Amino acid sequence: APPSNLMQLPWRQGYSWQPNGAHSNTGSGYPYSSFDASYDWPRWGSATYSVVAAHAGTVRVLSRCQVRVTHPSGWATNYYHMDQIQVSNGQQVSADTKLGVYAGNINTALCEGGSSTGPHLHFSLLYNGAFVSLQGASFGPYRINVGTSNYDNDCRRYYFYNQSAGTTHCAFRPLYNPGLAL
């Protein structure tokens, strides 16, 4: 309810990135708290783009590739495979405040160890410090609908519904960010 807890998509207002299918933070668990996004889903070494806060709150920097933003209500968002982090621990931000970019290379994207296909943001929803399901969560005019397995991207099950337009938006297609809803 708090406007400052209202969420937008985690890239700049006025811009469009391609989401993949919802999944858990680990990629093999439950609930489906996360989706990935990238402008073009390119190979390592390509240009990458600005990640922004989905909502207002307190920044905590967990490594050079991971950032958390926590709203006073207890809702929070996690941002992973980051680079060029331009916020500090304890810093106050609002929706659309730039946090950094998603990392363009293996070394920078996987600063904590592990695997990935190529440059993208790994974005997650939390409440009370725990990862929670994205099901029914709103980002601007979009209501997210979660699929039936990790990374499920079949548009009959996984999609964003735009309440301002009556349109359904699928994985691996540009998703426009109009910012916060009134």
Q: Binding-site residues, please?
A: 23, 36, 122
Is 120 part of the annotated catalytic residue set? yes
In sequence order, what are the residues at sequence separation of 6 or more whose Cβ sits closer than 8 angstroms to the Cβ of residue 101? 48, 49, 50, 51, 82, 83, 84
- ω before 3 within 30° of 0 (cis)? no
The nearest distance, CB 122 to Zn ion, in angstroms, is 4
**Nearer to Zn ion among residue 36 and residue 96 (C-beta):** 36
The nearest distance, CB 119 to Zn ion, in angstroms, is 12
**Nearer to Zn ion among residue 17 and residue 56 (C-beta):** 17
Based on its alpha-carbon atoms, the radius of gyration of the chain, rounded to whole angstroms, reads 15
- Taking the alpha carbons of 35, 58, 111, 82 in that order, is the dihedral positive or negative? positive
Output the known binding site for Zn(2+): 23, 36, 122
Is 71 part of the annotated catalytic residue set? no
Residues lying near Zn ion in the complex (CB under 5 A) are found at: 34, 36, 122
**Nearer to Zn ion among residue 91 and residue 152 (C-beta):** 152
Would you please indicate which residues are annotated as catalytic (active-site) residues?
A: 81, 120
